[PDB]
Design a protein around this ligand. Structure first.
Ligand SMILES: [Cl-]
Ligand SMILES: [Cl-]
Ligand SMILES: [Cl-]
Ligand SMILES: [Cl-]
Ligand SMILES: [Fe+3]
Ligand SMILES: [Fe+3]
Ligand SMILES: [Fe+3]
Ligand SMILES: [Fe+3]
Ligand SMILES: [Zn+2]
Ligand SMILES: [Zn+2]
Ligand SMILES: [Zn+2]
Ligand SMILES: [Zn+2]
Lengths: 307, 307, 307, 307
C-alpha cells in the first residue's frame, strides 16, 4: 500500500565534521525509528546541486558539492499511518532528541519536517547489478515478465530530481490530473527509474523542534542530555498544512545526464510539452528542482509500497 | 502613513561578478522603480549571517560572509498602495525584465517577492553622524525635544535582525498583540534603532517571475531582450497569501553585539521574557533570525512613514 | 534599588577552544539564570591584564592577552535578594550543573563564587553612541538635564578596574567612609564611567562546586550528565564570609589610558591623595587591580539599580 | 556676502613627486595669494574619481586614485570682487609665476582658471568633531538653535560632488530656477553638508598662463626665474565667458555613500525627480559629476559667506 512520508529537512556546514557526525548519529537515529511497527523504511538524501533550467538559475549546476559552503539533507521516513511517525517521536523522545541535538554544532537551518501523502507512485524495488539475473529468472518462472523492473541501484548509485511546486488555491485537481498524465508519459525517457507525487498534509512540530515557549527555552538552554517537554508542541500536524498547497514531484534517474534530458522531455517533446503546460498553469511557486543523492536507505520501503 | 512593502528575495553566487552586477544593474532597477508616483523608497539588504541562538544553529554565526558560497539579497520597496507595485512592474516591464534577467548567470534561487502590510512601526528617519547637531537644534527650536531620534546611520552603517515567524491558524491576534508589547519593551535595549512588524498579504507573481506555461517558456528561452507576456501571471497577489500566516519582525541595531544581546533581552530579562513567551506559544515556524546589512537605500521612505 | 552581586570566578586555558565554549555554553547559562524572577541582570568579564603601578608589578601590563597562557573570567550576576541566587542554582540544578560542567576540559582553577552587598553605587545605564541624542532629548523634555549620563558603551566597548582589598579587623568603617569619599572625588577624572563598592557577605558553596564528601566524589566521577546532590553543600553563604573583610572597588572607564591616569588621580592629585591615604592605612591586602573587559552583559541590571 | 570664485584647474602626473611639490609649493602660493585684502579664503581639491551613474560611465568609479595615471586639481580661491583676483596675480606676479612654473615637470594639462559668481549658496562654516559642543552651547546661549549647523569637517574629512553643466542659450533662467528648487529639496538627504551654484563669468588669462605671442614664447623659453610680461594677456575676464553658459553645482557630503545615494535622490525620489527633470531639459552638456576631496583649505571663506 502507499505509505505516508515524513521528510526531515536541514542545512548544515559542508565540512568533514558534518559527514563524520552523519556516520555515527545517522545510523543510530535510523535504528531508533525502526523501533515502531508502523515504520516501513527510509531514504536519506543529500542535495548535490540544482537544475539550472538552461541559465534561469545560471549560478547553479547539477553538482555543486565541491564549491558549496553548506549541505542540505532531506531524510524521508515512510509510515503505514502518518500518526505512527508522531507516536514514534514521542515514544522514543529521550533517545531521538539527544541524538538529533548532537548535530547542533553543524546546523545552519532546520530541522523542518513536513508530512506528505503519496497521491501517485510508480516506484520499483531497488536492485544491485548483481541481482538482475535472479529477478529475471523468478519473474519468468512465475509467468510475470511484465513485473521485471528497471535496475534501480541503491546506496548512492542513482540520482533523484526533487521538484518543488506550490499550487494556486482551487487548481489542485488540475495540477494533480496533469502531473499524473505527465509522469505516465515521462516514464518513456531513457534511464527513468520511477516517480511519485507527494502532497503535503501538515508539519510535525516535534520533528521540527517547534515547541511553545517552554520547549523553546529547553531547547536553547540544553546541555544535550535533557529532553524538552514533548507535550509542549502547540499544533497538530494538519494545523500546519500550507496553503498554497505544496507538492513534491520526486523522479529517479540512472545518472545526472538522464535526469537533465529526461526531465527535459517535458520541455523538448511537443506532445509531452502540451500536457506539462497544464501543470505549469496551476503554479504559485516552482518548478524548482533540487538534485539529490539517495545515499543511506532502507530499501524495503518499496516492498511495502509494491506489495 | 504606513506604506506597503514588497520584499524581493534571491540567492546568488558569492563572487565578485555578482557584486559587480549589483553595482551596475541595481541602481538601474531602482531608477526604473522610481518612475511610479506611488513609490516611496527602498531598503536593499544582503544577508551577512544567521543568529545562532547559542548553539541551536551552531554551524551559523552572525557574519558568515567570508565562508559562504552564496549571498542572499532581500530588497524592500515601499509603496503607498501595494497595487502601485503591481502597476509599476507592468508599466515598466520592458526595462525591468531585461534588467532583472541580466542577473541570470549568478542566480541560484529566486526571485520570490512576497508583499506585506506594516501592522506596527517604530522606525526613525536615518541620519549620518554629521547631521545630529542640526537635528537637535531644529527640534529644540520647534519645542519638540521628544522628536529627537536615535542616530540610525544609512548605507551599511547599522545592522538588521530579520526574524521570520509563521503562526498557528487562529492565533494571529495573540501573536500580533504580544509582539507589539514585546517591541514596545525592547526599545529600551542599548543601540536599538527601531522596529516594524510586516504581515504577509500575498505574493507578486510578476516580481517572482512566476507565470503560466506561456510565460515560463518565454523566460527559459529568453536571449535577454524579449519580454515574457506580463499578462500571463495566473494569480493575484492575495491568492498567494500563505496560511500559516507569515510575519517578519524587522529590528534595527547599532551593531551586531547590540543586536545579539538586545534581541537577547527577550530571553534574558525576566519581565520581557514572560511577555515574549506569549509570542512563542503561537508559532508554527520560527523564530529564525537572519542578520542583514542595509547597504543601498532610499532613506526617504521613513519620511513618508513618519509624516 | 541596590541588588546583591554573585561573582563567579575561574581560570581557564587561553586557547580558541575555551572561547568557543564560552560562545555556546555562556549564553545557555545566562538564559537558565534568567528563569528566576529575582534575577536582575549580569555583567561578564574577562581579565585582560593587571595594573602595574609603575613597576611594582613590573612583569604585568594592562593588556596581557597576547602573552598569557590562561584567561580569568569574572561573571557578575545581580539579584534582588542574595537568597534568590541560591534558590536559582537549586531550582535549575540539572541544567546548570551539566552546562557548567561542560567547561571542565578547559578549567585550571575555580569556580569560586563569593556573594557581595553593594555599599556604594554611582553607576549609569549603558548606552551605545547611537542613543545619546534621544537620551538628551528625553531628559530635557522631562526637565531633568542633570540626569543625562556619560556614554557608557556596552559589550566590550569600555574597561573596568577591579580593585581587590582586604581590611584590618576593626577598620571596616574607616575603609568604607574613606573609599566613598575617594570615589566621590574620583568621578571628576576624564572618562570616568561609574563606580561601586562591593562588600563580601559570604560564598556560594553550590556555585563554587564545593560540596561535602558525597558531592565531591560525584563531581570527580561525573560523566557530565549526572547531578551531584545539591543538598550536600555543608555551609551557608554567610558561614564562608572572610575575615579580614574583603571588598572590591569596581570602577569603569572609557579606555585603558583613562583608567591608568584616572585611577592614578588618587596618587597624583594631592587633595585626593590625602583622602585615599585613609583607605590605604586600613589594608591587610591590596590594592591589587585587575583590568577587565565587560564583554557579555544584561544591561538592564543598571535599570534596576537606578529605578 | 557671496564672494566670487576663481577655480584653477590642472592635470598632473599621479606620482609621489607631484604630491611632494604640492606640499612645498602649494602653501607658498596660498600665502602669496593672502597678500591681497580682497582674498577671503580658499578650498583646494584633488579629484578622487567620477560618479558612474549606474554604468553610464561604467569604466569610472568614485575612487579611482589607486589606478589613475593622472591627478586633477581644482583650486578654489574666494574674492570680495573678482577684480581682486586679477589684481592679486599682477601685484604678486614675480612670486606667483615662479612658484606656479615650478610645477612644470609634473604638468599634463592646464592651468585653466575660470571665474564664477555664486548665484545660490547654502554652505555652513566648517567644524571639527571636537567643536560641536561649544557651537551648540553658544547658539543656545544666543537663542539661535536654528543656526546650529551640521558638522562639516575640514581638511579631507568630507567629500564634494562637482557637477558640470552647460545650458542651452535662452534656458539659463529655467536652469537657475529649477536647480535652486532642486537644492532646496536635496538638503533633506542624510549627510548633506551644503551646496552652492557657480555661474561662469569669464576666464583669467593670467591665471591660465594664456598670453599673446610674446608671453607664450617667454613661458616656453623660461628657465624658471624670469616673468612673462603680465601685460601681454590679450583678453579681459568677461571676453572669455563661454556660451553655452557653464555652471558648476557644488554639493558637499559626509562620505561617498551619502554622496552617491544623496545626489541620487534627484533620480530616486519621485517628487524631487520631477523638479530635477526641469534642470535636465535645459542642458547642452552634462551632468558630469567629479568626486573631489577638499584637502587643503582656508575655512574662513565660509565666515565671509555667512557674515
Ligand atoms: Cl519542470
Ligand atoms: Cl526571538
Ligand atoms: Cl589604589
Ligand atoms: Cl545629476
Ligand atoms: Fe521525524
Ligand atoms: Fe517588485
Ligand atoms: Fe551563581
Ligand atoms: Fe588665480
Ligand atoms: Zn515540471
Ligand atoms: Zn522573538
Ligand atoms: Zn586605591
Ligand atoms: Zn542633476
Amino acid at each position: 500500500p502507499k505509505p505516508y512520508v515524513a521528510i526531515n529537512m536541514a542545512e548544515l556546514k559542508n565540512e568533514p565534521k558534518t559527514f563524520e557526525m552523519f556516520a555515527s548519529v545517522g545510523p543510530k537515529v535510523c535504528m531508533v525509528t525502526a523501533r515502531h511497527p508502523g515504520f516501513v523504511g527510509f531514504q536519506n538524501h543529500i542535495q548535490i546541486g540544482i537544475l539550472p533550467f538552461g541559465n534561469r538559475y545560471g549560478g547553479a549546476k547539477m553538482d555543486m558539492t565541491k564549491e558549496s559552503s553548506t549541505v542540505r539533507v532531506l531524510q524521508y521516513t515512510f509510515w503505514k499511518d502518518w500518526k505512527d511517525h508522531e507516536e514514534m517521536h514521542r515514544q522514543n523522545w529521550s533517545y531521538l532528541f539527544r541524538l538529533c541535538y548532537s548535530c547542533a554544532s553543524q546546523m545552519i537551518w532546520g530541522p523542518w519536517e513536513p508530512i506528505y501523502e503519496i497521491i501517485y507512485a510508480n516506484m520499483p524495488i531497488n536492485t544491485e547489478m548483481t541481482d538482475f539475473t535472479a529477478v529475471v529468472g523468478k519473474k519468468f518462472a512465475e509467468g510475470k515478465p511484465l513485473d521485471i523492473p528497471v535496475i534501480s541501484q541503491p546506496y548512492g548509485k542513482r540520482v533523484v530530481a526533487f521538484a518543488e511546486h506550490s499550487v494556486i488555491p482551487g487548481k489542485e485537481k488540475q495540477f494533480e490530473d496533469a502531473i499524473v498524465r505527465t509522469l505516465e508519459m515521462l516514464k518513456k525517457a531513457p534511464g527513468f527509474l520511477g516517480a511519485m507525487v507527494l502532497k503535503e498534509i501538515g508539519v510535525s512540530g516535534i520533528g521540527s523542534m517547534q515547541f511553545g515557549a517552554k520547549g523553546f527555552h529547553q531547547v536553547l538552554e540544553n546541555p544535550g542530555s535533557l529532553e524538552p517537554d514533548p507535550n509542549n508542541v502547540m499544533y497538530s500536524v494538519p494545523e500546519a498544512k500550507n496553503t498554497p498547497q505544496q507538492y513534491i514531484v520526486h523522479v529517479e534517474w540512472a545518472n545526472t545526464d538522464a535526469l537533465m534530458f529526461g526531465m527535459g522531455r517535458v520541455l523538448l517533446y511537443p506532445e509531452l510539452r502540451q500536457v506539462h503546460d497544464e501543470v505549469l498553469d496551476t503554479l504559485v511557486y516552482g518548478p524548482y528542482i533540487r538534485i539529490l543523492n539517495p545515499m543511506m536507505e532502507g530499501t524495503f520501503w518499496r516492498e511495502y509500497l509494491n506489495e
